From a paper:
Following phosphorylation, the coiled-coil pairs swap partners by interacting with the other neighbouring chain from the opposite hexamer, which resulted in a register shift that propagated around 115 Å along the entire coiled-coil. In the phosphomimetic state, the register comprised bulkier hydrophobic residues that resulted in a more stable interaction than for the dephosphorylated form. Furthermore, the C-terminal residues of KaiCRS-[name]/[name] interacted with the CII domain of the opposite hexamer, whereas the lack of electron density for the last 30 residues in the wild-type structure indicates more flexibility in the dephosphorylated state. We propose that the proximity of the nucleotide to the phosphorylated residue facilitated more efficient phosphoryl transfer.
Here we investigate the primordial circadian clock in Rhodobacter sphaeroides, which contains only KaiBC, to elucidate its inner workings despite missing KaiA. Our kinetic data identify the difference in the ATP-to-ADP ratio between day and night as the environmental cue that drives the clock.
Numbering used by the authors:
A (entry chain I): 258 to 401, 411 to 515
B (entry chain J), D (entry chain H): 516 to 558
C (entry chain G): 413 to 515
The structure:
C-alpha cells in the first residue's frame, strides 16, 4: 500500500545463494540513480567490473550511473580492514557523497571477521548512523541479530519441486503498511525481475511446469463435461423427434 | 405422444437452466478466489 | 562458496531401489542457464545427459521413467480401443437401418 | 428409418471431430510442456 517501503527504513533481503539478492539491491540502486538521486553500493564479495557485467545481463545499466557521477560502487574484502576501520571507512564515505540509498551486500560476510557480538556492534552502529540521517539502507543477507531492527524484510526463495528449481519471494515484514501475503513466483530476464500473475485454483500452490500441467488438466476436464452435456441434450432431442414422427403417422 | 413431447421440452428447459446457473456460479467463485489472492486491495 | 561465479551440484540419490545420478547449476552469475535437475549417465563415452523428462507428473528418473512411459502407452491403447468399439457400434446401427430400409 | 440413419451419420461426424480436436490439443499441450522444460531458450 502506498507504493513501496518508507523512505528512511531499513530493508533486509534474505535468501540462499543464487536467489537474486544482489539483483534486487542493484535494482533499488539503479532506480534511485534514475530518479536523479545518489546511491552507494558496498559489495564485499564481487569486483566492480564483474558486478557491472553481471548486472548488465539483467538489463540494468550500472555503468551509465557510475559514469554520470550518481552511483559509487565500493568493493573491499572483509579481511582488508579491521572491524573498526571498516565502520570508519563506510561512515566517512557516506558522509562525503551524501547518498540517498546505501546498500551493503552481503551483511553476512563479516561473520568470521570477529566475534558475534563485535560484528553485531559494528553492524548496529552502521544501521544507526544510516537511520539517523534519513538514508535508506538495503542489506543483503544469506539464509542458513539485527533482523529485529529491520522495518522491511524480503525473503527470496529458489526451491526444488518436480525436478526443477523455481524462484519465489514474499514480504516477511513491512511495518507501518498493508501488503500482500502471497508467496509469488517471479522470473529473471533481460527485462529485470518480473512477477508472474497470481495462482488461481482450488488446489493452488503450484509453480513452474506443474502450473501449466494443471491448467491443461482443467481445460481437459471442462471439455469432457461439455461433451457430456452435449450428448445428453442430443439424446433428449432425439426422443422429441421420435415423438413427432409417431404423432405424424 | 404429445404429453411425452411436452415432458421432453420441460426437460430441455431444466437442463439449460442448470447449465446457465453452473456457468454463473463458476464465474462468481472464480472472482471470489481471484479477490482473495489479488493485489487490488493495495491500489 | 560465496566467492564462486558458477556452482555445479552433482547428486546420486536412492529412489526405487536404485541410485540415479543427477546434476544442476546452482549458480551461474552473468548468464542465463537451465533450471532443470537433469539426469546423466557415465560410460566409455564420458558424461552424457539424458533427454529432459516430459510428463504431467514429471520428476521420475531411471527405471521409474520407463515404467511410466509404458503405462502411458497402455492407457493410450486402451482409449483407442474404446473409441474403436464405439465407432463400430454406431456403424452397425447404421447398417441395420439400411437392412430395414431395403426390406 | 431414414431420419434415424441421418442422425447416426451426424453422430459419427461429431465423434470424429471430437477425436481430431483431442489429438490437436494434446500436441499443443505436449509442445507447451516440452518448452517449459527445454534448453532451447539458451541456443
Ligand atoms: N540474463 C539472465 N537471464 C536469466 N537469469 C539470469 C540472468 N542473469 C542472471 N540470472 C540469474 O540471476 C542470478 C543472480 O543471482 P544473485 O547473484 O543476484 O543472487 P545472490 O544471493 O547475490 O548470490 P551470491 O551468493 O553470489 O551473492 C544468477 O544465478 C542467474 O541464475
Ligand atoms: Mg550476490
Amino acid at each position: 500500500a502506498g507504493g513501496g517501503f518508507f523512505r528512511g527504513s531499513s530493508i533486509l533481503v534474505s535468501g540462499v545463494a543464487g536467489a537474486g539478492k544482489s539483483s534486487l539491491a542493484a535494482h533499488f540502486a539503479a532506480a534511485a540513480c534514475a530518479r536523479g538521486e545518489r546511491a552507494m553500493y558496498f559489495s564485499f564479495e564481487e569486483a566492480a567490473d564483474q558486478a557491472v557485467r553481471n548486472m548488465r545481463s539483467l538489463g540494468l545499466d550500472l555503468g551509465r550511473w557510475r559514469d554520470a557521477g550518481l552511483l559509487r560502487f565500493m568493493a573491499t574484502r572483509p579481511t582488508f580492514y579491521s572491524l573498526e576501520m571498516h565502520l570508519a571507512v563506510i561512515l566517512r564515505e557516506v558522509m562525503r557523497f551524501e547518498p540517498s540509498v546505501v546498500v551493503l551486500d552481503p551483511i553476512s560476510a563479516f561473520t568470521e571477521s570477529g566475534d558475534r557480538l563485535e560484528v553485531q556492534s559494528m553492524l548496529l552502529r552502521i544501521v544507526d548512523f544510516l537511520k539517523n540521517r534519513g538514508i535508506t539502507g538495503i542489506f543483503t543477507h544469506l539464509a542458513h541479530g539485527l533482523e529485529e531492527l529491520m522495518d522491511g524484510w524480503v525473503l527470496m526463495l529458489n526451491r526444488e519441486v518436480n525436478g526443477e528449481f523455481n524462484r519465489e519471494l514474499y514480504l516477511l515484514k513491512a511495518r507501518g503498511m498493508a501488503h500482500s501475503n502471497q508467496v509469488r513466483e517471479f522470473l529473471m530476464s533481460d527485462r529485470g525481475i518480473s512477477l508472474l500473475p497470481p495462482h488461481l485454483g482450488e488446489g493452488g500452490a503450484l509453480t513452474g511446469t506443474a502450473r501449466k500441467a494443471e491448467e491443461a488438466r482443467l481445460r481437459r476436464a471442462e471439455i469432457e463435461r461439455q461433451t457430456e452435456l452435449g450428448r445428453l441434450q442430443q439424446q433428449i432431442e432425439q426422443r422429441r423427434r421420435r415423438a413427432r414422427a409417431q404423432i405424424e403417422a | 405422444l404429445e404429453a411425452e413431447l411436452q415432458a421432453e421440452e420441460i426437460a430441455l428447459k431444466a437442463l439449460v437452466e442448470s447449465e446457465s446457473a453452473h456457468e454463473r456460479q463458476r464465474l462468481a467463485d472464480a472472482d471470489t478466489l481471484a479477490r482473495s489472492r489479488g493485489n487490488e486491495r493495495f491500489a
